[PDB]
Design an enzyme around this catalytic site. Sequence first.
Site, mmCIF file in Angstrom:
data_model
loop_
_atom_site.group_PDB
_atom_site.id
_atom_site.type_symbol
_atom_site.label_atom_id
_atom_site.label_comp_id
_atom_site.label_asym_id
_atom_site.label_seq_id
_atom_site.Cartn_x
_atom_site.Cartn_y
_atom_site.Cartn_z
ATOM 1 N N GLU A 197 53.946 -55.413 -9.253
ATOM 2 C CA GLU A 197 54.484 -56.697 -8.777
ATOM 3 C C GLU A 197 55.243 -57.454 -9.871
ATOM 4 O OE1 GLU A 197 51.082 -58.714 -7.037
ATOM 5 O OE2 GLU A 197 50.778 -57.129 -5.564
ATOM 6 N N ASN A 227 54.588 -50.382 -8.240
ATOM 7 C CA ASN A 227 53.955 -50.779 -6.976
ATOM 8 C C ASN A 227 54.256 -52.252 -6.700
ATOM 9 O OD1 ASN A 227 51.939 -50.145 -4.730
ATOM 10 N ND2 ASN A 227 50.777 -51.768 -5.791
ATOM 11 N N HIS A 285 51.236 -54.955 2.921
ATOM 12 C CA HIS A 285 50.356 -56.011 3.441
ATOM 13 C C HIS A 285 51.127 -56.824 4.476
ATOM 14 C CE1 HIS A 285 47.058 -55.329 0.685
ATOM 15 N NE2 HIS A 285 47.883 -55.388 -0.344
ATOM 16 N N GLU A 314 48.821 -50.016 0.248
ATOM 17 C CA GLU A 314 47.798 -51.052 0.467
ATOM 18 C C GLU A 314 47.882 -51.587 1.892
ATOM 19 O OE1 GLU A 314 47.774 -54.005 -2.649
ATOM 20 O OE2 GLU A 314 48.334 -52.544 -4.211
ATOM 21 N N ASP A 362 47.481 -53.056 5.365
ATOM 22 C CA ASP A 362 46.628 -53.717 6.342
ATOM 23 C C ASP A 362 47.538 -54.603 7.191
ATOM 24 O OD1 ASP A 362 47.003 -55.809 4.417
ATOM 25 O OD2 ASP A 362 44.924 -55.661 3.724
#
Lengths: 335, 333
Positions: free
Chosen positions: A135, A182, A218, A248, A250
């Site tokens: 990030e 990432n 996300h 990641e 969700d």
Amino acid sequence: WGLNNAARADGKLWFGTAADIPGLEQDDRYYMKEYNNTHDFGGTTPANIMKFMFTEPEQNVFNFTGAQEFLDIAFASHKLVRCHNLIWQSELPTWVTNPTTNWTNETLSKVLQNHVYTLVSHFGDQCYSWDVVNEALSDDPAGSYQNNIWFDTIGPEYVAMAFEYAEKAVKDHKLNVKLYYNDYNIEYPGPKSTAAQNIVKELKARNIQIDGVGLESHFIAGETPSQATQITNMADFTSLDIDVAVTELDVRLYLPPNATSEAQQVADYYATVAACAATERCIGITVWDFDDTYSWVPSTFAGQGYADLFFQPDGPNTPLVKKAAYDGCLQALQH
Amino acid sequence: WGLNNAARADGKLWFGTAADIPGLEQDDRYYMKEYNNTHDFGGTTPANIMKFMFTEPEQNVFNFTGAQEFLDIAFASHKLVRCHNLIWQSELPTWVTNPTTNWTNETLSKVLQNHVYTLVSHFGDQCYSWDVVNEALSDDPAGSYQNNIWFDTIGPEYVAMAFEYAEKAVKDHKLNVKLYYNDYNIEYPGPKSTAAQNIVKELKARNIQIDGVGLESHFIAGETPSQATQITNMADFTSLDIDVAVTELDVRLYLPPNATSEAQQVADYYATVAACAATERCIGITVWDFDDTYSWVPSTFAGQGYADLFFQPDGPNTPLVKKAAYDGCLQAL
Ligand SMILES: *[C@@H]1O[C@H](CO)[C@@H](O)[C@H](O)[C@H]1NC(C)=O
Ligand SMILES: *[C@@H]1O[C@H](CO)[C@@H](O)[C@H](O)[C@H]1NC(C)=O
Ligand SMILES: *[C@@H]1O[C@H](CO)[C@@H](O)[C@H](O)[C@H]1NC(C)=O
Ligand SMILES: *[C@@H]1O[C@H](CO)[C@@H](O)[C@H](O)[C@H]1NC(C)=O
Ligand SMILES: *[C@@H]1O[C@H](CO)[C@@H](O)[C@H](O)[C@H]1NC(C)=O
């Protein structure tokens, strides 16, 4: 027949899940039975224990014990591990955030080099990959580098430097570990995604090893980019001679869920897994844990939840309930 | 007057239920009151604690404590126990699935032989029967042997081997335990049921002991084979000079239940129990737990459930409600 069997049948390396291990999840036998289920999970990511604050809690004082416990548990289930993460702006220990003497470019650079080189060298090929930088990009202006202690002290060179010293560790120990960048909000075309692609281009131009980009994914139900939007975005990355991974995933809802938003969730899990399935060099999908009980979502995103593939209506240490979203993932790999 | 009273009055050995004991169910006083109710349940099967990973957690290091707690609880309400199971593809310990070295035919054949023989020898006649091999047949293609560590490393002979060594234990210790093969999707005529019958035929032809076939009977409301279909299928098995048992009966629904699907559930529980009742050598019916709260179904099949004879509208630790499906079972007996 589960998600990992289906993903591997499609040529992927895994269907995976993060887990907050070591931690209370280990006391939940219903959770652990499904975590250990290789039909569903052939890959895993430590949600916390390999981060900077836990692995270097004081300067030059490294702590590998909890991380090794995670790796031992993962190995017992034949799970490939995405080690996560080396350099990140968040969850940093106080000796980095509040030093008694101000960092300089020279001294924080050596802090960065030592942390990266030691962690990559120590764990070796127990890691399939490392998220070397996490990030680094801002959301405002979307293209730009995010202001953090590394960027403010070292400048944008800190990203190349991290991959450079991770590559040194791999070559000095004849490792096979893959080096990943990432980030989130890079799952759709736009200034942030293009900025991530430019990071890859610039490292490739400097002959610095970078093997892949992690697309955190996300998402909010109904805001998730369409399958077609993710397919073209993934192609933009893979055209740079790298892999991608959905790292990641969700899909959070505004609570309480209802029939409409649950249907959106199934569709959005489907779209993301299907885009990876359509992408030759998307190596796998990892969900950011699989049980609402332990999901990070309610704490990070106010008023939201229900984001994972399973939940426990009676709370920790009671039976799991598989959600329709699970079948969305499975159908995306079969289709 | 309950299901086990009625089953025993019809010549069956039990009406029974699986239970995931030891575990969370022991802490539900309403669940345990009904589990302990011998009017309804004169037989039981441990859902997990007798499996390989719990009874041999490391190589040649056996742990019988959990299984003995289950048997002690079963004994307290006079339940005959279907011990379950010896050789199965799933949930093997990491010393079997992630070994240092790689298994060979010989080193795995001895693991199998050792596991079967010492488990059968140790528990003796605390077990009415053992499910000696569980689910050895594939669904695709249906007739074929399933691929697993036993079949891959040892070959199809591993089935006959497991029964051979179970028979060795019963001979050496003069036991009465019955030796069962147990599988699903063999409750109706078809390639898989025929393949199970061929296993029985093969064992009988080689003078290896095999006493029964367990018909798991995990069904979906409306998809359950008709009573008449089950009657013929059971007869194909019993004609081979064995017993049969309905071993893991439940009838799951797509949620939420509605008036049609619940009526289907009643009809399907009735069909299965009535088929056993009509079959002289069907020795009993076991449901795969009796309380929706603890059923395996919701963890496995999204959007399905309601599969059991009782449920708890107000959740764990609150009173059970008896479903119409219970009366279907009773009427069939
Ligand atoms: C899951 O696997 C870990 C690692 O071997 C083990 O410690 C734990 O007991 C397992 N939990 C299960 C099988 O429920
Ligand atoms: C290392 O970490 C373990 C568990 O993560 C902890 O128990 C121990 O106190 C730590 N040791 C240090 C920071 O020296
Ligand atoms: C479901 O939730 C969404 C998100 O809050 C909302 O927009 C929608 O109106 C809801 N549908 C209902 C309550 O039927
Ligand atoms: C059921 O029987 C077991 C075994 O004796 C006992 O431990 C338990 O307390 C009983 N529960 C009841 C009767 O509610
Ligand atoms: C009952 O549920 C079944 C199974 O989903 C469905 O096919 C049927 O239409 C439903 N009948 C109703 C709601 O009357």
